[PDB]
Amino acid sequence: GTHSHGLFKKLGIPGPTPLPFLGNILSYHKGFAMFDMEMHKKYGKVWGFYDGQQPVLAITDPDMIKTVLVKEAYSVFTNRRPFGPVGFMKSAISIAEDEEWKRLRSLLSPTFTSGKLKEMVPIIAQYGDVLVRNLRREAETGKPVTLKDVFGAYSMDVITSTSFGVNIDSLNNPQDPFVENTKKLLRFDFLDPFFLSITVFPFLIPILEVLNITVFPREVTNFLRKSVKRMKESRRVDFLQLMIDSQNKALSDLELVAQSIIFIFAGYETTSSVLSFIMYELATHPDVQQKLQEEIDAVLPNKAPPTYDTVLQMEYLDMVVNETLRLFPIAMRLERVAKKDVEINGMFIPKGVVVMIPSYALHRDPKYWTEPEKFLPERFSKKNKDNIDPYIYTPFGSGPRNCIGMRFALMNMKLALIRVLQNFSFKPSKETQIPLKLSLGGLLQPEKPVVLKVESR
Amino acid sequence: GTHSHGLFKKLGIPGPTPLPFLGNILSYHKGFAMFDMEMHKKYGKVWGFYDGQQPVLAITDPDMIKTVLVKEAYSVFTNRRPFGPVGFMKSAISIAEDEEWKRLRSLLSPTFTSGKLKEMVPIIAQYGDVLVRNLRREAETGKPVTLKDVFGAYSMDVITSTSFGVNIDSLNNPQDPFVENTKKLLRFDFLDPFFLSITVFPFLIPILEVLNITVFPREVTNFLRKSVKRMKESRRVDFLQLMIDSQNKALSDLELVAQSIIFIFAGYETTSSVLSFIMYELATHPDVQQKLQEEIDAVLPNKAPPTYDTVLQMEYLDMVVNETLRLFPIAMRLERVAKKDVEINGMFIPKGVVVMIPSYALHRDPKYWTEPEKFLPERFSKKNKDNIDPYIYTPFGSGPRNCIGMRFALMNMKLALIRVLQNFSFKPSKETQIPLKLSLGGLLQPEKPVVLKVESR
Numbered sequence: 001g002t003h004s005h006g007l008f009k010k011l012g013i014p015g016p017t018p019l020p021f022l023g024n025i026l027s028y029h030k031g032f033a034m035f036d037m038e039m040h041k042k043y044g045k046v047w048g049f050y051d052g053q054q055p056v057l058a059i060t061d062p063d064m065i066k067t068v069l070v071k072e073a074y075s076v077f078t079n080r081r082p083f084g085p086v087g088f089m090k091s092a093i094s095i096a097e098d099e100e101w102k103r104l105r106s107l108l109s110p111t112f113t114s115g116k117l118k119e120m121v122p123i124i125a126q127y128g129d130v131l132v133r134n135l136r137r138e139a140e141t142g143k144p145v146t147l148k149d150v151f152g153a154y155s156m157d158v159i160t161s162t163s164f165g166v167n168i169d170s171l172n173n174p175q176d177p178f179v180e181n182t183k184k185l186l187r188f189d190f191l192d193p194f195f196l197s198i199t200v201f202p203f204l205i206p207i208l209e210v211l212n213i214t215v216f217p218r219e220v221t222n223f224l225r226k227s228v229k230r231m232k233e234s235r236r237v238d239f240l241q242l243m244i245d246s247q248n249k250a251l252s253d254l255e256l257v258a259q260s261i262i263f264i265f266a267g268y269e270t271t272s273s274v275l276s277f278i279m280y281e282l283a284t285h286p287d288v289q290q291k292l293q294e295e296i297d298a299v300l301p302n303k304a305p306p307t308y309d310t311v312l313q314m315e316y317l318d319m320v321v322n323e324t325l326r327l328f329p330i331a332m333r334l335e336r337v338a339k340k341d342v343e344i345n346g347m348f349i350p351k352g353v354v355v356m357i358p359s360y361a362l363h364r365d366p367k368y369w370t371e372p373e374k375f376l377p378e379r380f381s382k383k384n385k386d387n388i389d390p391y392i393y394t395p396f397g398s399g400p401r402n403c404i405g406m407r408f409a410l411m412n413m414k415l416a417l418i419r420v421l422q423n424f425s426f427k428p429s430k431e432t433q434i435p436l437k438l439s440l441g442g443l444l445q446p447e448k449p450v451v452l453k454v455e456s457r
Numbered sequence: 458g459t460h461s462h463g464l465f466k467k468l469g470i471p472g473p474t475p476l477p478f479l480g481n482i483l484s485y486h487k488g489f490a491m492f493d494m495e496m497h498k499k500y501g502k503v504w505g506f507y508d509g510q511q512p513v514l515a516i517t518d519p520d521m522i523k524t525v526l527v528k529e530a531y532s533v534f535t536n537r538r539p540f541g542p543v544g545f546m547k548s549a550i551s552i553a554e555d556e557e558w559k560r561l562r563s564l565l566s567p568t569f570t571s572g573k574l575k576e577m578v579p580i581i582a583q584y585g586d587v588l589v590r591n592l593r594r595e596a597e598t599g600k601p602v603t604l605k606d607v608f609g610a611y612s613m614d615v616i617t618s619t620s621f622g623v624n625i626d627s628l629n630n631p632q633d634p635f636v637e638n639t640k641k642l643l644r645f646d647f648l649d650p651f652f653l654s655i656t657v658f659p660f661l662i663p664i665l666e667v668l669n670i671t672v673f674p675r676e677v678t679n680f681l682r683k684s685v686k687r688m689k690e691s692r693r694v695d696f697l698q699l700m701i702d703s704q705n706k707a708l709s710d711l712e713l714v715a716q717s718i719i720f721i722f723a724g725y726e727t728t729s730s731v732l733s734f735i736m737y738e739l740a741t742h743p744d745v746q747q748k749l750q751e752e753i754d755a756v757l758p759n760k761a762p763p764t765y766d767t768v769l770q771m772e773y774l775d776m777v778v779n780e781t782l783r784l785f786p787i788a789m790r791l792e793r794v795a796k797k798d799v800e801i802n803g804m805f806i807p808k809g810v811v812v813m814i815p816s817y818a819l820h821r822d823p824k825y826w827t828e829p830e831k832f833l834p835e836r837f838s839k840k841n842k843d844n845i846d847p848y849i850y851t852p853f854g855s856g857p858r859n860c861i862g863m864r865f866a867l868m869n870m871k872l873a874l875i876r877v878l879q880n881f882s883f884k885p886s887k888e889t890q891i892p893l894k895l896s897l898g899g900l901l902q903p904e905k906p907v908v909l910k911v912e913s914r
């Protein structure tokens with residue numbers, strides 16, 4: 001029906017007029033980001049819309065954003081927008097709620113410290129070499145390289161190793177039952193058929209749950225499920241034991257598996273998308289690539305192996321990474337649910353409303369960014385960075401619920417970039433789409449995969 | 458989703474563009490009839506639209522109409538558009554399908570013959586008087602009469618008596634458990650919340666069925682359910698025994714009850730709506746009322762009691778009744794489902810499509826009717842009637858599935874009119890809405906009830 005559809009009318013908040021049942025979902029025909037930018041330009045700092053019957057309050061005010069993601073996090077905006085059905089995956093940290101979440105966050109918080117992460121480099125760099133060897137091969141038969149595939153396999157390599165102790169050159173081995181299963185853990189597309197229907201029929205979620213149907217394909221999960229059985233363990237620098245030790249408030253077995261699936265995915269798919277986009281930028285801006293190559297050679301003599309401290313010394317590398325994250329956040333939106341009524345920065349918001357920060361739109365707003373469409377690493381130099389509002393630029397979220405893997409992701413990505421840029425230069429191929437276009441779907445991804453010419457140095 | 462929504466595109470049939478999930482239902486915001494007239498004027502003789510995902514093919518071609526309602530009735534278009542949930546009411550003749558239907562149609566066919574119907578007049582006329590006595594009272598305190606209430610109670614009186622043997626002046630007795638229950642059997646409004654949702658979620662019907670939820674309120678049905686227990690019977694001119702005799706292919710007990718509910722309703726609600734609309738027309742056209750009064754006095758001397766044959770002799774009465782039915786059909790649409798694929802008059806129609814004849818629109822079409830908006834009984838005189846296409850004018854449907862009660866309805870209505878017009882004249886009250894407006898909802902009914910000044914003669 002239409003019971004919820006008078007809400008934003010009642011509070012006097014502007015927004016697209018909802019259709020019965022569908023709310024505003026039809027506006028998603030060209031993707032979240034384009035919907036969010038259209039609505040932002042058309043309504044200013046705040047607006048409201050309905051996913052089916054679910055009210056969503058978009059906010060773009062930096063101070064209101066700090067309020068939701070930080071100040072009122074524990075007391076009001078503790079959880080993300082429920083999404084389901086998920087079976088045992090209800091226990092994964094990113095999905096968990098309230099006290100089950102804070103528990104898992106504490107339990108897993110020590111996994112991603114500079115110390116551990118420091119010990120993860122001699123591992124994460126051994127697969128630096130394999131990627132380079134792989135790349136050099138595919139650059140001797142000098143034909144276009146699909147970044148998502150080569151980075152994909154590196155990305156898988158790194159997490160399987162740092163989290164489970166499993167070494168596999170996944171690129172050559174697309175047939176290892178471990179490689180194939182994990183690959184199938186891809187990001188969910190919220191504008192796909194199944195998810196549109198489940199937004200317009202949330203009253204069906206509990207029906208799917210009962211039938212043990214899940215958004216996480218069962219074949220994928222069940223493998224990884226007991227896959228840790230003889231793996232955890234033979235009865236050191238591994239996410240696994242780092243979690244096993246936390247068992248003997250302590251972590252249950254089926255919860256532990258749910259954490260591993262969550263991570264496997266992250267260190268795999270997020271990482272490889274971002275890496276692809278950086279190389280795309282580097283390839284379409286040779287001067288930036290050359291300046292980056294010079295920072296790398298200067299900090300690391302004759303192809304010297306990167307270390308924890310050398311990585312962190314590279315300023316221009318940091319600016320490149322950040323500037324690619326500005327233009328291509330993997331999140332697009334950040335979201336919390338109000339467990340109770342709230343008044344924030346003068347705005348009343350009833351219990352159950354989804355408050356949504358549209359990062360993609362904010363990352364491209366003319367008010368906060370000069371020439372926001374352009375790839376300009378200099379935006380993040382020492383001179384200009386203090387300019388940037390930490391609640392406008394949020395590629396890893398903010399507050400107690402931000403990305404737990406942030407430091408690992410940044411590190412792992414830069415290690416990859418260094419090893420690759422030390423040995424190669426990248427250039428547009430004939431088939432490189434320029435300018436690149438993002439999938440009109442529900443994921444910040446290229447419609448056509450990035451392909452690039454790889455030249456040895 | 459949208460799987461069915463390419464159908465009419467595939468067959469090359471014009472029609473409003475469907476929205477995902479909703480199909481065209483939003484077009485119902487101003488009622489079926491207005492939707493059907495808009496679409497007819499805008500697409501000509503045939504068009505297609507979707508109720509949620511259900512395809513509906515509207516047809517206005519007289520010959521194509523004879524094809525659906527008559528020629529291909531038994532072989533293709535045997536059933537009406539399924540509608541549910543209905544519990545045991547699946548067994549009622551108007552809802553029954555295929556062979557269960559033809560069975561019930563044969564079994565109940567002899568109930569409505571000129572002979573039986575002839576024996577039903579000394580009964581149907583005894584309540585002629587009560588209505589007159591009631592009317593005279595409410596015309597001595599000369600204040601406006603709400604037709605739907607006075608006719609309503611007469612309408613109930615007549616069927617309770619002719620079908621069950623229950624005499625009750627229902628108007629004075631709105632407290633008899635028999636009166637109140639039956640009253641609650643009102644026509645279903647297809648554009649009401651519950652029915653809109655169930656058109657956009659037909660996959661929920663079987664869920665409602667399982668929970669014993671029905672469109673026929675349970676309290677209403679259960680009373681009438683066993684209400685016939687000590688009634689059928691004490692172990693003559695009554696629909697009841699007429700059905701009991703057919704038991705001892707023969708009619709089951711719970712089926713019999715389902716038939717009685719179906720009838721009770723019909724002889725009650727259809728009858729009283731039509732009677733109200735005729736009086737409205739008579740009141741807004743005094744000359745027609747006076748001519749009608751003169752036919753009646755001429756055929757029936759000094760307030761002489763109407764008989765079966767006298768009723769049928771009154772030509773101008775027939776034209777009035779028919780002309781009111783033209784302007785205000787109770788059906789609005791007629792519908793059949795294609796059980797199988799079919800090609801009709803050169804048009805292919807796949808299995809499962811609802812073929813819909815929009816009577817309200819057809820009854821008002823400038824191609825078939827001069828000044829179609831105007832109440833002109835003369836349209837149906839001996840001179841002009843043979844003009845009228847029997848597949849354009851269909852107030853009682855056509856073919857093997859037409860109104861089984863037609864002759865009883867026509868008779869019962871005319872008996873009422875004669876007894877009323879012999880004694881009174883009707884006139885607009887101050888509050889009479891003129892011109893009348895039909896509920897923008899899902900039923901041909903007045904938004905504001907007809908109220909009229911009743912003057913004794």
Ligand SMILES: CC(C)c1nc(CN(C)C(=O)N[C@H](C(=O)N[C@@H](Cc2ccccc2)C[C@H](O)[C@H](Cc2ccccc2)NC(=O)OCc2cncs2)C(C)C)cs1
Binds near residue numbers: 082084095190333403
């Ligand atoms: C009500 C129902 C119809 C709904 N379902 C959904 C699910 N869909 C499609 C989403 O895109 N949901 C989004 C989401 O992914 N939230 C997520 C946190 C997040 C948000 C943005 C960017 C990065 C991480 C929270 C979810 O638990 C996801 C689900 C998941 C798990 C494994 C593999 C794939 C996917 N888990 C993760 O965080 O993935 C690991 C990652 C870690 N860091 C970056 S990605 C929300 C921001 C809306 C939304 S609404």
Ligand SMILES: CC(C)c1nc(CN(C)C(=O)N[C@H](C(=O)N[C@@H](Cc2ccccc2)C[C@H](O)[C@H](Cc2ccccc2)NC(=O)OCc2cncs2)C(C)C)cs1
Binds near residue numbers: 551552643652719792
């Ligand atoms: C799929 C689902 C969502 C749907 N449900 C519906 C139900 N609704 C609201 C309707 O208006 N359905 C219509 C209908 O009433 N069909 C009907 C035949 C008919 C059609 C038009 C005019 C007169 C009789 C067939 C149904 O069985 C009705 C239902 C009913 C029973 C008792 C009391 C009230 C209502 N039974 C009757 O015929 O009522 C007794 C009458 C006899 N003569 C005139 S009315 C159809 C023409 C569409 C349509 S689609």
Ligand code: HEM
Binds near residue numbers: 262263399402
């Ligand atoms: C470039 C790569 C990555 C980006 C851009 C990224 C970004 C994000 C963002 C935006 C969020 C949501 C923050 C919020 O709601 O405020 C998030 C959550 C999360 N990320 Fe990542 N992430 C990346 C890689 C990783 C990796 C490698 C891991 C490894 C485990 C990881 C684990 C998580 C977890 C567990 C959460 C949810 C934490 C919680 O709810 O408490 N992420 N990430």
Ligand code: HEM
Binds near residue numbers: 550855
């Ligand atoms: C003025 C009053 C009435 C009108 C205008 C009317 C009109 C109609 C119409 C249009 C139909 C559908 C026909 C079709 O699909 O082709 C119908 C069906 C029916 N009517 Fe009536 N009707 C009236 C009164 C009655 C009465 C008093 C009864 C008494 C029992 C009755 C019993 C039925 C039945 C049983 C059906 C369905 C028959 C079947 O499916 O086989 N109707 N009517």
